[PDB]
Every structure is written in structure tokens, then in C-alpha cells.
Amino acid sequence: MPLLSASIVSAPVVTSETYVDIPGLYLDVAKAGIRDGKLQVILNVPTPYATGNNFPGIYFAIATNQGVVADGCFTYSSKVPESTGRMPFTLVATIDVGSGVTFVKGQWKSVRGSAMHIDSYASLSAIWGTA
Amino acid sequence: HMPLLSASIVSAPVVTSETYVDIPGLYLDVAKAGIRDGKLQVILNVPTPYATGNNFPGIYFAIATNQGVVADGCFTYSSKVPESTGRMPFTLVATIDVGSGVTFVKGQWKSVRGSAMHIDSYASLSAIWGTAA
Amino acid sequence: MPLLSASIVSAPVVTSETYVDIPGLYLDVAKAGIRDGKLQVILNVPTPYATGNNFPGIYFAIATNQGVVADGCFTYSSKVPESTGRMPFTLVATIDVGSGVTFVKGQWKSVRGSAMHIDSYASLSAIWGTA
Ligand SMILES: CC(=O)N[C@H]1[C@H](O[C@H]2[C@@H](O)[C@@H](CO)O[C@H](O[C@@H]3[C@H](O)[C@@H](O)[C@H](O)O[C@@H]3CO)[C@@H]2O)O[C@H](CO)[C@H](O)[C@@H]1O[C@@H]1O[C@H](CO)[C@H](O)[C@H](O)[C@H]1O[C@@H]1O[C@@H](C)[C@@H](O)[C@@H](O)[C@@H]1O
Ligand SMILES: CC(=O)N[C@H]1[C@H](O[C@H]2[C@@H](O)[C@@H](CO)O[C@H](O[C@@H]3[C@H](O)[C@@H](O)[C@H](O)O[C@@H]3CO)[C@@H]2O)O[C@H](CO)[C@H](O)[C@@H]1O[C@@H]1O[C@H](CO)[C@H](O)[C@H](O)[C@H]1O[C@@H]1O[C@@H](C)[C@@H](O)[C@@H](O)[C@@H]1O
Ligand SMILES: CC(=O)N[C@H]1[C@H](O[C@@H]2[C@@H](O)[C@@H](O)O[C@H](CO)[C@@H]2O)O[C@H](CO)[C@H](O)[C@@H]1O[C@@H]1O[C@H](CO)[C@H](O)[C@H](O)[C@H]1O[C@@H]1O[C@@H](C)[C@@H](O)[C@@H](O)[C@@H]1O
Ligand SMILES: Cc1nccn1-c1cccc(CN)c1
Ligand SMILES: Cc1nccn1-c1cccc(CN)c1
Ligand SMILES: Cc1nccn1-c1cccc(CN)c1
Ligand code: NA
């Protein structure tokens, strides 16, 4: 009954108009001998913030070796927030390992040129089951 | 042997409602899966919702079965009329007893103070089947 | 295939500089005969708010009998929010029970002297698995 988990405590701050991996949030599904069945994947980024001056925020995605499975974002409700507060983010998706999945990873990308910040615990977890 | 249930949507008609109404498509047919007993850990995941309105807007979300609401929570903005209605990620986790007579699990929502409710991207309802300790 | 769950509907409002238990968010792992393997733990506080006058917020942690496993926080984006809105918070961590884990619990602590509020459903859940 495999449980996969990866966690980080920081990432270099980057601005990106397109998805880039969150370094370290990666599960090697091949190395675990999972070749079929289903994975419930949670991307948990409980304390991120975004800096910028046009309604800042961050998109996050669960991706496999076949690309993005699901994505979401937080954004602030001010164009230039008084302070860039911590905006807890969770994304949950279920994947078919049998289609060719060798890995699951977290990615992120900028909302409107925002710099993306993780400076504390963030995780990527997966529970293996069947249909 | 180890079922994982999942349903996802990408949008819903924008509605205002003072009481819980189903989020269309966020439904798990538990009877169809032959789960008649045991426990379900259910996650309602609405990562990118927003609410529109003029009195501290927000949205309540619930996990419901055929026996009604199991658990609920809400997000709300911190301004009466937000400069822009930002995306407020929302997750709700609840564990249900299937053997009470649960045939289905669903997500519902309702307006905070007359807010219009918006999903325009990925949202999911997931469940892992288990047993008691 | 055990699923552990605990839920609450309120807690006395408190301010604390350091982690204190969220009363009622506790899983007795030993009492369930879980002695080894892995636990995917979810702390779900979907409708908390914080009151204060210095960028309010709340830190939340998953803790065992061996201390804090993972933690995160939300904060408002204003020094004195017009209204202290509901800021849904989820935290996910995976623990090794065989190290000496007898219980899992949720804890919280103040951001900048904030009073911490739960007045509706909050849960702590865990799925048991293996490496
Ligand atoms: C509250 C906060 O955001 N603290 C930040 C601080 O943010 C300031 C800026 O946003 C600034 C303008 O661009 O506005 C405020 O500052 C004004 C004034 O401009 C400032 O010079 C003065 O001293 O204070 C006033 C109001 O009191 C904001 O304070 O920016 C600094 C960067 O220089 C830090 O990021 C600070 O972050 C906090 O740093 C602490 C260490 O001193 C500590 O680690 C806190 O945990 C950390 O706060 C957390 O991260 C923030 C980014 C934010 O999410 C906050 O809610 C978190 O709690
Ligand atoms: C930032 C935002 O909310 N974008 C919305 C936009 O809202 C605009 C209004 O809030 C507006 C009121 O004057 O303020 C800004 O716009 C002004 C100006 O009025 C506008 O004409 C000019 O070009 O820009 C200035 C300031 O930059 C706000 O931008 O309403 C529009 C039109 O109806 C959209 O909803 C827009 O939503 C965004 O739309 C994008 C494509 O047009 C894209 O799809 C973005 O994802 C989407 O933004 C997201 O959803 C928003 C509702 C909000 O949650 C935001 O944080 C998200 O990123
Ligand atoms: C919008 C709100 O916060 N209502 C809240 C009120 O807040 C006011 C604020 O609007 C403005 O007037 O400034 C004052 C002074 O600081 C207050 O901050 O405070 C009241 C008590 O002091 C209540 O707490 C009131 O809370 C609402 O209460 C009604 C019943 O009267 C309902 O139960 C609402 O659910 C509840 O609103 C909910 O909680 C509040 C704290 C906030 O999170 C809302 O977004 C949320 O919907
Ligand atoms: C930003 C936005 N407006 C309407 C839909 N979306 C959106 C949000 C997150 C992800 C996606 C799909 N990549 C679209
Ligand atoms: C908004 C609020 N104030 C006190 C309690 N609540 C609340 C919030 C979400 C759900 C419920 C219970 N249906 C109550
Ligand atoms: C608040 C903050 N600034 C930088 C890092 N952190 C932070 C946030 C949540 C948890 C922890 C680790 N205790 C640190
Ligand atoms: Na692809």
C-alpha cells in the first residue's frame, strides 16, 4: 500500500510566464515499482507569497512526464498589496499510472510577472490505489 | 481491492444561492463502485474560486452525501468591496461511514452575503476507501 | 486499511507566541495498533480567522509525541484588515510511525500576537500505508 512523499523548505525566487518545476517536489513513480493503478496526488504549498505590482499571485500545477494534470492559483485582491500575505494553496488530482507515468512533480508560474516565494515547508504526496 | 474515487470539473454556471446547491459534476457514485461499508476520506478541492458582491464576499462549500451535509467551510475577502476579487484556494477534508446508507458523495456551495459563485478552472472531489482502526 | 479521523467545531480563542495544541485535533495512533509503516496526515482548517492589529495570521503545525513534523501559516495582506476574512488552511505531511509515534495532533500559534479563531468544522485525518 505505497505512500510517496517529497518535501522542500525553500526554492530560489524566480519570475516565469510559463510552468517551471518547483525544485525538489518530485516523486519517482518508476523507482517505486508503480506501473499501473491510480495515484491520488496532493500538492501542498501552505505558506507561499507572490511579489509584484499588478494583482500578484502564483499558479501551481501537478505534472507528470506527460505534462500538466491539473492546476490552480491564488491571487491577492489589491493591485499592490500593503503586505504580500501568506496564501495557503492545496491542489488534488488523481492520475492513471498505466498511461506511461514515470514521475509526478510540482510546477509553478507567475501571475502577471509576480516573483514566486517558498521559504518554508511545502510537500508533494501520493497514495496508490486502483479503479 | 484499494479503490480511489475521483471527479473533476473545469467550470460551473455562475449562481447566487442563500442555501446549498450542488456544484454540478462534483459527484462520486459510491453505490456504482460496490463500496457498501467501511470509511471514505473525502477531499473537496476548489483551488481557484472567486466570489463577486458588495458586502465582504465569499463562498461556503460543503461535502454532502445522500444523507445531507457532512462538513462545510468558507473563504471570505477582508474588504467590503475588494479592489479585485482574487483567487482564494479552498480545500475541505471529511471522513464518512459508508454503511449508514451512503450511496453518493457530492460538493455543494452557497453564497456568503449574496455573492455570485465562480468556478472557471479545475476543481475536484476525491475519496480514498479504508476501514476503521 | 485504516483511516483515522478527528474533527472539532470550535476552540477557546487564545493568543500564543509558541505552538499549543488545537483541542480535539488528535489521533491516537498507538490505540489503533499502528506500530510501523507511514501515515499521510492532513490538517484541514477550512474557515479560521485571526484578530489583531499587525498583519494578523495563524501558524498551524502537524505534531506527534516527538514534536512538530511540518508547519505553515496564513496572513492577511493589510496591517489592520477592514474585516478578518476566512482564510482556508490545509497542511499535508507524511510521518514514520516506527520512530516512536503514539499520537498525531494539530497545533497552532499566533502571527504577531493574533488571537486565533476556529468557530466551525476543522479536521485531522490520516491514511496508513508503507514505504
Ligand atoms: C508584514 C510583512 O509583510 N513583513 C515583511 C515586510 O513587508 C513590508 C513591505 O511590503 C512594505 C512595502 O513594500 O510595507 C510594509 O512595511 C511598512 C514600511 O514600508 C516598513 O518599511 C516598516 O518597517 O513597516 C511598515 C509597516 O509595519 C511591510 O512591513 O517586508 C520585509 C522585506 O523587507 C519582510 O519581507 C517582512 O517579512 C517578515 O519578515 C520578518 C523578519 O523581520 C519575519 O520573518 C516575518 O515572518 C515576515 O513576515 C512574513 O512574510 C511576509 C512576506 C508576509 O507574508 C507576512 O504576512 C508574513 O508573516
Ligand atoms: C486582476 C483582475 O481581477 N482581472 C480581471 C479584471 O478585473 C479588472 C477590474 O478589477 C478593474 C476595475 O477597473 O481593475 C483592473 O483593470 C483595470 C482597468 O479597469 C482595465 O480596463 C485595464 O486594462 O487594467 C486596469 C488595471 O490593470 C482589473 O484588471 O476584470 C477582467 C475583465 O472582466 C477579467 O475578469 C480579469 O480576470 C482576468 O482575466 C484575464 C484575461 O482578461 C485572465 O484570464 C486572468 O486570469 C483573470 O484574472 C483572474 O481572475 C480575476 C477575477 C481575479 O481573480 C485575478 O486575480 C485572477 O488572476
Ligand atoms: C464582515 C465581518 O467581519 N463581520 C463581522 C464584524 O466585522 C466588522 C467589520 O465589518 C467592520 O465593521 O469593522 C468592525 C470593527 O473591527 C468589525 O471588524 O465583526 C463582528 C463582531 O465584532 C462579527 O464578528 C461579524 O461576523 C459575522 O457575524 C455574523 C452575525 O452577526 C455572521 O455570523 C457572519 O458569518 C460573520 O462573518 C464571518 O466572520 C467574520 C469574522 C468574517 O470572517 C466574515 O468574512 C465572515 O463571513
Ligand atoms: C485565470 C483563469 N481565468 C479563467 C480560468 N482561469 C484559469 C485558472 C487556472 C488554470 C487555468 C487552466 N490552465 C485557467
Ligand atoms: C461564519 C461563521 N461564524 C461562526 C460560525 N461560522 C460558520 C462558518 C462556516 C460554517 C458554519 C456551519 N454551517 C459556521
Ligand atoms: C514566516 C516565515 N518567513 C520565512 C520563513 N517563514 C516560515 C513560515 C512558516 C513556517 C516556518 C518554519 N517554522 C517558517
Ligand atoms: Na504532454
Author numbering:
A (entry chain A), C (entry chain C): 0 to 130
B (entry chain B): -1 to 131
Structure paper excerpt:
The bacterial lectin BC2L‐C expressed in B. cenocepacia is an interesting drug target involved in bacterial adhesion and subsequent deadly infection to the host. For BC2L‐C, the C‐terminal domain (LecB like) specifically binds to mannose, while the N‐terminal domain (BC2L‐C‐nt) has been structurally characterized as a novel fucose‐binding domain with a trimeric TNF‐α‐like architecture. Thus, BC2L‐C represents a novel type of superlectin with dual specificity for fucose and mannose in the N‐ and C‐terminal domains, respectively. BC2L‐C as a virulence factor binds to carbohydrates present on the epithelial cells of the host.
Crystal structure analysis of the apo and the holo form of BC2L‐C‐nt demonstrated the presence of a druggable (ligandable) region (site X) in the vicinity of the fucoside binding site. Of the two other regions (X and Z), site X is a deep crevice extending along the binding interface. The study indicates that the fragments bind in a newly identified binding region in BC2L‐C‐nt when the fucoside binding site is occupied. Remarkably, the binding mode of one fragment (KL3) could be validated by X‐ray crystallography at high resolution, further confirming the ability of site X to host drug‐like fragments. ITC and X‐ray crystallography performed on one fragment confirmed binding at the expected location and therefore the ability of site X to host drug‐like fragments. The affinity measured by ITC is sub‐millimolar, which is very promising for such small fragment. The complementary structural and thermodynamic data give clear view of the relative importance of apolar and polar interactions for fragment KL3. This could be used in the future for structure‐based optimization of this first hit. The selection of suitable linkers can be done based on the distance (measured 4.8 Å) between the nearest atoms of fragment and the fucose core.
